[PDB]
Amino acid sequence: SLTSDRMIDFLSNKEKYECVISIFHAKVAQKSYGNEKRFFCPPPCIYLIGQGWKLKKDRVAQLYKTLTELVAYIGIGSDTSERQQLDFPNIYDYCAAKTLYISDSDKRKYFDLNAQFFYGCGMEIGGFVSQRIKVISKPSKKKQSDCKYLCIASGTKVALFNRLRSQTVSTRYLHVEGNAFHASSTKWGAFTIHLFDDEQETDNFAVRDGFVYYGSVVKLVDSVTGIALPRLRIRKVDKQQVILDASCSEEPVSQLHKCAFQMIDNELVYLCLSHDKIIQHQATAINEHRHQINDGAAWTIISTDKAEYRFFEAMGQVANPISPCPVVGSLEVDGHGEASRVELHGRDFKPNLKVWFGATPVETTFRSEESLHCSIPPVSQVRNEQTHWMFTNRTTGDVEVPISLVRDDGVVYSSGLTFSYKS
């Protein structure tokens, strides 16, 4: 059972002990018909981050020298779809699943991915799910315009990939690596796509809201690094040809569309791939409304998502799997005085969890899996002389506390949320 003090060593040393697992995937997948397989692309993948993973391995090592290599499997939550084995500085380990697919025998409109982790000795770490993924029959072809799920809104995340005659073997992905955009055969970037506005360059720019349409000027920005491509205009492609019809401005960019990115200064110059390098390619005109491009200039755009989980076995290493990790959506502060309750919303709340406003625990109850009403601790009892420096703001002067859920096991799940003592 987590004692008031071991918490303090953790909150002060978050990144030393906290295990982080992140699952990146697209929001959509194309169904497979008959006996065929259309692989989820970009490949769903898992990043293990934090040094906590090294200390987890250390614990299991000591534990099993008295009684090795960690393996993981991923599936789509159906018992006729075989689970598949995942092959493997802040990043501990990485694996992608390149041959996942879903067949038309499965009738679900939505599914999720479930990855389970084990050590080679056989101790289950646990199972983690991705976000909702929508099954699509085929990339949409709507020219106009209800749904909106298949559109791409300004300020959301996208992957960009490139097939080569739908056959050599390869597919490559837009990815920034060491300050440069490249085209990776194994890793893919989640980029924020922005609708560029007006005021012509560069580092600091204005953006509008709205859905992205063909013909719009767009900015691609790396999640991780903050590195951006030059401002580009998005164009639909129809095999090897860029389309330029004015009417395309009425056409929404959509999941799994073939598309191209023309330089703004030069209509014939397109964002293009050469092996793993990102280059500017000059096209040849066919038409007032049509350009011939290389295969490397035809991209495929898809919205993506991420599921992140954080835990640390704060006391000992635990016998049970650390799954299912809870996740917290938001806070709701109703009523005033001391007797005022604060509620939490999210997923996989279990009966065996206690809310920790900081180093101190608090009175908690338990409604269900997606709700958790609890008392707030009297303002006095949250800081002292072991907590104070981490708890009082150095700007406002007001007290701001990190919220945690901790299992009786001893494992703490840092919520990512910190509460602001204002109410």
Partner: peptide
């Protein structure tokens, strides 16, 4: 809204 981002210019073919 305003966003900051170092621009990476791709080389030329």
């Amino acid at each position: 809204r305003m966003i900051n981002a170092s621009v990476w210019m791709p080389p030329m073919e």
